[PDB]
Design a protein around this ligand. Structure first.
Ligand code: B12
Ligand code: B12
Ligand code: B12
Ligand SMILES: [K+]
Ligand SMILES: [K+]
Ligand SMILES: [K+]
Ligand SMILES: [Mg+2]
Ligand SMILES: [Mg+2]
Ligand SMILES: [Mg+2]
Lengths: 186, 186, 186
């Protein structure tokens, strides 16, 4: 990856390049998926810069941001038989880590009997924004799997699935005074 | 609604559950609609947490957040003849309330002869973000009606239609010094 | 453009109006494109209001916000043979200006050998959010071109293409102490 002049104009005809340099329409399901990972990465960035999380939560979120570029590398690289060089791929390893974090940060929390109205601390509010963008990215990743059941891995979608659960847990940790809950029809 | 362990892994195959436990693809038009309501709810949360609205506007926004979970409940519950239990549904009631708020908060504002360039106060800017996310949720709700003209109600989309108008009005109330306007081609 | 009562209820059946008053479904590709320009405009607004840019960047972003309504006017107005009045259209001039800003703001920056983890200053983070929303708007504009290769211009998409490159450059200028970089698989 070399970011130099940034604008190359090779996308001005509505096509763009996968990581193997093959050309796709800018509406291609695969591009949509890793573009949505990028949008999710930016949403986490806003939680970091405007929410001012403590060091431990900062460290978790920075690792997730790095994971999301691993997922984008995966989604942008077609799966091929016997590649010349090993591609970067999401592994179950990644999802186990998210689950370990889910359990650790959920341990100190009481169960909820309704949904949370997002808000409270700036950090909590921004983690809810990130949560919903990640969930949008997950849907796009499943759509890429549908379009390419052999060429696209399911593990990016699985990673994004578990990640939005972690972001919900972290949004609660970021409101130590408690959340306001939904009153159905009230 | 019980939120306990959060991650269940039952969505790791790209399917999820409606409120009646029936299974749908994670690209299903109905899921997209109430997921986008969730995304809109988070955007309002950001306006509350980073925009610091006064008490009365805070009360309006918290009621809208509650309404949006009512709309998500509606969209996630297929309409059936003679249900066992009365489902939670959006009613005209809800939209009449949004209209009453539109009229009250628009009363003190002069007419505009161009579009507003979003900005100014943090609250105004965040309300514009929420406004555009709500409009995206509205389009998804109409797409859900198209895919299920008998099983999905139109009132969620109608609520979202009127809601983005209210958020525009409130975004102006949140810039008492006035907004910067579009200069076509300038 | 006259903004008065705001809510008219003429969109309550899932249809809306183009600039020529012709009726389209609220899922129409053209509407999605200029609605996404609106969402991008709001994201820039948040960067202005919460990011506190200096005078030079403020002036650039306000011009871009104005451009995006020019782009929305273009996308909302079908191209016709010999129209009665000259329509507002994006022109190459707009993109040349974006390129001039890319070159000027990128001149003092070192090349990058990896991707940036969005974060740092609020301004940098919010410019990354805007960057990814603009890229989503670009995809929608290409989708509108595909649906209407004669009735929709390519210049809006081209403008949005170059614009996300500028927002990336400005996001780096807004982190003068440097960005955190992606470590593949680390
Ligand atoms: C897909 C892609 C992205 C996607 C997804 C990338 C991701 N990882 O999430 C996203 C949306 C993030 C994107 C964004 C941008 N991009 Co981009 N991107 C591309 C692209 C096509 C692939 C880059 C990539 O991810 N390579 C990573 C891997 C897949 O490739 P590789 O380095 O060869 O690694 C291989 C092996 O060595 C192995 N591997 C490598 N490391 C490791 C580690 C381990 C552990 C393992 C097991 C394997 C392994 O895996 C790979 C298999 O081939 C490149 C073009 C290119 N071919 O470089 C453009 C490219 C780098 N992007 C570009 C640009 C400008 C950008 C943006 C600035 C666009 C914008 N305005 O927003 C942003 C920057 C984002 C940021 N925050 O920094 C330009 C740079 C142009 C220039 N000269 O300046 C390029 C060249 C595209 C172009 N227009 O020509 N992009
Ligand atoms: C659709 C859905 C959502 C949607 C829409 C929900 C909405 N209301 O907007 C959204 C996207 C918001 C969502 C998000 C989340 N969800 Co959810 N959700 C579901 C689901 C399928 C339905 C929940 C619901 O809305 N119930 C409301 C109504 C429909 O339920 P009900 O009380 O039975 O209503 C009946 C009657 O009592 C009557 N009624 C009740 N009250 C009233 C009032 C009035 C006036 C009337 C007239 C009638 C009435 O109406 C119904 C009759 O048909 C459940 C699974 C399930 N089957 O319960 C998961 C579920 C609760 N969600 C789950 C989770 C994990 C989450 C998230 C944390 C996911 C994430 N990481 O983001 C977030 C949390 C959101 C938040 N801010 O708190 C999990 C919890 C797992 C666990 N044990 O911890 C579940 C169980 C799904 C699963 N994975 O198995 N979810
Ligand atoms: C498409 C559109 C939008 C789109 C795109 C607009 C854009 N420019 O980006 C977007 C999404 C931004 C939108 C947003 C909103 N909209 Co609107 N919009 C419309 C619409 C259809 C067109 C308005 C427009 O852009 N006119 C600009 C040009 C295309 O039209 P024109 O003035 O006739 O200009 C012509 C010529 O003179 C020439 N021209 C004009 N100037 C110049 C300059 C140069 C240099 C050149 C070369 C040519 C040129 O070009 C045109 C060719 O015919 C109108 C309905 C209508 N038909 O008027 C509603 C309308 C103005 N919108 C409306 C509303 C309510 C809104 C929102 C508040 C919705 C919401 N709740 O978010 C927001 C406000 C946004 C904001 N930040 O201020 C309502 C207002 C209702 C009322 N009485 O109050 C209307 C009337 C729609 C309706 N519901 O009936 N809208
Ligand atoms: K580029
Ligand atoms: K879950
Ligand atoms: K309206
Ligand atoms: Mg899930
Ligand atoms: Mg409307
Ligand atoms: Mg490009």
């Amino acid at each position: 990856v070399h970011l130099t002049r940034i604008y190359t104009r090779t996308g001005d005809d509505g096509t763009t390049g996968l990581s193997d340099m093959s050309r796709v329409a800018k509406t291609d399901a695969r591009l949509v998926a890793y573009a949505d990972c990028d949008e999710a990465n930016a949403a986490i960035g806003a939680a970091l810069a405007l929410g001012h999380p403590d060091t431990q939560i900062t460290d978790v979120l920075r690792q997730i941001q790095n994971d999301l570029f691993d997922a984008g590398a995966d989604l942008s690289t077609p799966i091929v038989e016997n590649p010349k060089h090993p591609p970067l791929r999401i592994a179950q390893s990644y999802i186990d880590r998210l689950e370990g974090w889910c359990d650790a940060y959920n341990a100190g929390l009481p169960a909820l009997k309704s949904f949370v109205l997002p808000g409270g601390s700036p950090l909590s509010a921004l983690l809810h924004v990130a949560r919903t963008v990640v969930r949008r990215a997950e849907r796009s990743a499943w759509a890429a799997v549908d379009a390419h059941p052999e060429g696209v891995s399911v593990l990016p979608a699985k990673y994004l699935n578990r990640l939005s659960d972690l972001l919900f847990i972290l949004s609660r940790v970021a409101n130590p005074d408690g959340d306001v809950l939904w009153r159905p029809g009230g």
